[PDB]
């Protein structure tokens, strides 16, 4: 739902990932497994989860780097470099 | 609301299986149950 | 949907017209009376509700038939109606057969037309000719003066150019515009 | 015979549960009775407000319940199965039926 | 006239229309102004039409032709596909009335709301655009209420409505009759259509809640 | 007052069967939805006469009908066409019949003229 | 004026008949089909409301034409109809071309008469 | 004024008169046994004066004369 | 291609704003998501009640967002741009979007 779709790249929140992985754990050890607040498994899973949020955000950032919009910095030059335009460097004022 | 088919309504991911007894399940459910698509 | 106060009256009026207010309908003749021309009409239209229920019009008895006539019925074109002819039916506002009925539009048959050419019985029509026709006897008048009576063994035509050609299988008689008279 | 999963069931364990479900756009009423000596669930299927149930059968794992009954106008044409989520040797019990309790009762419908 | 409401941090559009009626009564201590507002009343009750079509015309063309006559923005429409007229058709009078008649014979719902034209199909529903739970300011438990004040004879189109439920919630103008809601309670759980809304409000004294009449669905997920 | 009368006609009124209507003839009447004589009337169905039919044969004036014949008739002048080819014009002192079998028998009280199918031509 | 409870129903019924309950109307032939006689009718009547709004009937397609006939269509007086002839039109209660329509009197053309002699073509 | 088209009237006389009102801008209404036929928009002297001396009760307030609004050529 | 300004936007800075807007007499629903690592706004566009958004893109200054998507029946044909009111070097931020906050998100419609 949040990955690659027919209309570009989306972004998932944290809570959806947390619920999905907690459901996976629930299935792993039955409905009786505890996963909230006081569980050591809870403290491991929540800490583990926040990092992949960064990975998803960075991946989403990467995709737009090769599009008319979203390009920035070095990547912007490559996009407009195809059309033979380059940034101007330092310039000196001129006058009379 | 605790199992699949709600995820397709709530637009979520199906939970992967834990592998055990693979190649015995997958042949049967995939033929007798199918997948929500 | 059904919450507004106006929708209730809308549905009530829609349902009220369903069981009353009959104005016109098509039908087919099934019973014919030749003395005092009248016909029995079986309406063709019907509807089926979603609840698996159907609405059928019943057979209507003794609807008077109209024909082009005048002078107190001394002049009239009485064509040979048969059962099965498709005709249109009209319903009168009040029961013209009684003066005490309290209802109105309750399937009081008013009259029926001679015939209507709908799909499934559409006979061909001549683009320009007033043809009065019978099983095998035809009377044709054309705008350009010519008139003709035809049948499978006789022909009596009077053309525009003073031509008379009374003819038959066994012989013919004709008159030319030049005043000639001949017997074939 | 392509089929797609379209419905799942759960049981609270009450010995005489009865509820109404909708399958393939049609509606049916189901009754579940628990048998003590045979420790198994008895399922009855019928139309809404019907005098008697149309089908009665005993529930078992990996057995096509509706197989011999796809010739009636009031019986679903899909597939009804019970298969476990845990160890394959577990048999149907009283409280172990549900999306996460151990046994997954499921209905799937052919693609038409 | 436009009306906004919310909670001290934002206000969502709750109604927009024309002032149909207005009167003032000022007995002694306090004047009390009254209003009656209509959502597109002027357009729906005066837009005349005169159209006709022959056998073979695609029904999808007739629908678009009539809506453009109504002169309102198209909120959402579900086209008919390759449907074609079976008999010649003629339309006159108010355009709204003619469209409402086409609804009966093709299983489609037509209704204008806050200026937007909505044309959908009965029985089917659109994602969880709203979730109701104790966190979402619910008020009391849901209760089952019949969606109509009368019962129809049945063969016992089957796809049509016929069931529903009721819920109440704190005022929230970001909801529309044709939307879809998810009901996360402890007894009832599932997806429902919306069929009716009623917004009430007393600023200094009174309720500030909204009531939703839900209807069960049995069609495809359009 | 002034209900238009319909007659079988066409071609812009060039062809029409104008029968001699008289007072007292029984006819059926139809009312139009709107006042076709005006464009500002606000009412509907208020006795706006639409048109009238030539005649209707009800009880009390039911003339007899020939079971099978298209007879166009006047006070004493009759035109009869029968399905079997034969056609005939009649009046109390003349008769012009053209039968199926090539027979022409133009006749009159003072004499007759006829042609047989065998090609004979005679003058009575 | 608009205070009584009965006047409201009076106006509602008057307005309801305006958009439905079509029974009869005059018209003029604009399209003629000679195979399976049928004619296209353009109703002549119309009204203009005080609000500067007008009501026009649309063109009606394929109304069957009646002619004096019998014996199963073997005897008939087929006159040469032309476009422009003034005729009267009748509307059927139900859509005789379909058996599933839920409406009634919604401009279901029933049939047309050969010609009517009104003012201007008498 | 003269009729432009032939007219026929039946049924209750009151209903027919009330229809003639619409097409000619006239108001018809019976009251305490008296028939009143007038023309809309126009009015008849000061037959009554309202003031605090005349036992008025509270100030006048503007109220619309109908529960609905009509479309106008504006 | 003559175009006229006809609508302006504002954002409160909430990371998951979602609201409905009307453009060219048609109605659409918009979603805005804030990205931490890339410090940029992600915009999703789609029909009312649609299952999935029709278009998703990243917002940037002086870039025609809709350029490659004017070939669908449910996408506005106008022009959507973000340009600054202050110094030209300022890039789009979280709280600096609005008619007076520094960045002017605007929609303009062609003249037909």
Give a summary of the structure in a few sentences.
This is part of a larger assembly, with one copy of chain A (96 residues), one copy of chain B (37 residues), three copies of chain C, two copies of chain D (112 residues) and two copies of chain E. With 37 residues, chain B is mainly α.
**Gyration radius of chain A, rounded:** 23 Å
Q: Per DSSP, what share of the residues of chain A sits in E-state strands of 2 or more residues?
A: under 5%
User: What's the total helix number of chain A?
Assistant: 3
**Largest β sheet strand count, sense and barrel closure of chain A:** 2 strands, antiparallel
Going across the major beta sheet of chain A, what is the strand order?
A: 1-2
Count all strands of chain A and give the number: 2
Of all chain pairs, the largest interface belongs to:
C-F, 53 and 58 residues
Q: Please tell me what the overall shape of chain E is.
A: globular
PDB class: viral protein
Keywords: baseplate, Sheath, Tube, PhiTE, Virus, Phage, viral protein, sheath initiator, tube initiator, hub, puncture apparatus, fibers, wedge, tape measure protein
Entry title: Bacteriophage PhiTE extended baseplate
Chain A: Wedge 2 protein
Topology:
The structure is cut from a larger assembly and holds one copy of chain A (96 residues), one copy of chain B (37 residues), three copies of chain C, two copies of chain D (112 residues) and two copies of chain E.
Chain A: E1 4-5, E2 8-9, H1 14-29, H2 40-64, H3 73-81
Antiparallel strand pairs in A: 1-2
Chain B: H1 6-10, H2 25-32
Chain D: E1 3-8, E2 16-23, E3 26-35, E4 40-46, E5 55-58, E6 79-84, E7 103-110
Antiparallel strand pairs in D: 1-7, 2-3, 3-4, 4-5, 6-7
């Amino acid at each position: 739902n949040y990955g690659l779709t027919g209309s570009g790249f989306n972004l998932p929140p944290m809570d959806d990932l947390v619920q999905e992985t907690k459901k996976t754990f629930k299935s792993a050890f039955g409905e009786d497994f505890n996963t909230e607040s006081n569980s050591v498994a809870d403290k491991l899973i929540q800490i583990f989860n926040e990092r992949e949020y960064q990975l998803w955000l960075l991946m989403g950032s990467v995709y737009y780097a090769q599009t008319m919009q979203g390009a920035e910095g070095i990547y912007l030059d490559d996009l407009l470099g195809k059309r033979g335009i380059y940034r101007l460097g330092k310039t000196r004022s001129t006058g009379t | 609301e605790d199992g699949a088919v709600d995820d397709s309504a709530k637009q979520k991911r199906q939970t992967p299986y834990i592998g055990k007894n693979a190649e015995t399940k997958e042949r049967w459910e995939n033929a007798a149950i199918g997948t929500t698509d | 949907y059904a919450d507004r106060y106006d929708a209730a009256f809308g549905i009530y009026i829609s349902r009220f017209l369903r069981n009353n207010v009959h104005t016109n309908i098509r039908g087919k003749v099934v019973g014919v009376n030749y003395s005092g021309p009248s016909v029995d009409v079986q309406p063709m239209a019907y509807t089926e509700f979603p609840s698996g229920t159907t609405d059928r019009y019943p057979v209507i008895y003794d609807v008077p038939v109209l024909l082009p006539s005048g002078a107190g019925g001394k002049a009239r074109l009485t064509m040979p109606i048969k059962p099965g002819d498709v005709v249109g039916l009209s319903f009168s506002e009040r029961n013209e057969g009684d003066n005490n009925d309290q209802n109105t539009h309750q399937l009081f048959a008013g009259w029926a037309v001679t015939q209507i050419f709908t799909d499934g019985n559409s006979k061909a029509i001549h683009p320009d000719n007033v043809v009065l026709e019978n099983d095998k006897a035809i009377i044709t008048l054309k705008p350009d003066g010519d008139t003709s009576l035809q049948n499978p063994k006789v022909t009596v035509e009077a053309l525009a150019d003073g031509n008379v050609k009374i003819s038959n299988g066994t012989g013919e008689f004709t008159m030319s515009p030049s005043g000639e008279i001949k017997g074939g | 015979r392509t089929v797609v999963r379209t419905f799942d069931f759960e049981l609270s364990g009450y010995p005489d549960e009865t509820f109404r479900v909708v399958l393939d756009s049609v509606t049916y009423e189901l009754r579940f009775m628990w048998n003590e000596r045979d420790e198994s669930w008895f399922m009855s299927l019928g139309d809404i407000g019907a005098q008697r149930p149309t089908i009665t059968s005993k529930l078992t794992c990996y057995s096509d319940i509706l197989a011999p009954y796809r010739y009636l106008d009031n019986v679903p044409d899909g597939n009804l199965y019970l298969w476990p989520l845990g160890d394959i040797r577990t048999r149907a019990g009283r409280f172990n039926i549900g999306p996460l309790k151990g046994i997954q009762m499921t209905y799937s419908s052919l693609i038409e | 006239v436009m009306l906004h409401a919310g909670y001290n941090g934002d206000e969502k559009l709750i109604f927009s229309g024309t002032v149909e009626y207005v009167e003032d009564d000022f007995p002694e201590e306090t004047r009390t102004t009254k209003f009656i507002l209509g959502d597109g009343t002027l357009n729906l009750t005066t837009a005349t039409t005169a159209r006709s079509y022959r056998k073979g015309t695609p029904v999808n063309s007739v629908l678009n032709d009539l809506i453009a006559d109504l002169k309102l923005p198209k909120g959402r429409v579900i086209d008919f596909g390759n449907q074609t007229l079976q008999t010649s058709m003629a339309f006159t009078g108010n355009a709204s009335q003619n469209l409402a008649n086409l609804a009966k014979n093709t299983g489609s719902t037509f209704s204008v709301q806050d200026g937007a034209v909505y044309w959908t199909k009965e029985g089917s529903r659109f994602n969880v655009m709203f979730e109701i739970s104790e966190e979402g300011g619910m008020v009391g438990t849901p209760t089952p209420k019949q969606p109509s004040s009368s019962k129809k004879l049945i063969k016992a189109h089957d796809i049509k409505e016929d069931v529903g439920m009721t819920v109440s919630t704190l005022l929230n103008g970001a909801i529309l009759p044709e939307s879809t809601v998810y009901l996360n309670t402890r007894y009832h759980k599932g997806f429902y259509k919306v069929a009716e809304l009623t917004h009430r409000g007393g600023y200094e004294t009174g309720d500030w809640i909204t009531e939703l009449g839900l209807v069960e669905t049995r069609g495809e997920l359009i």
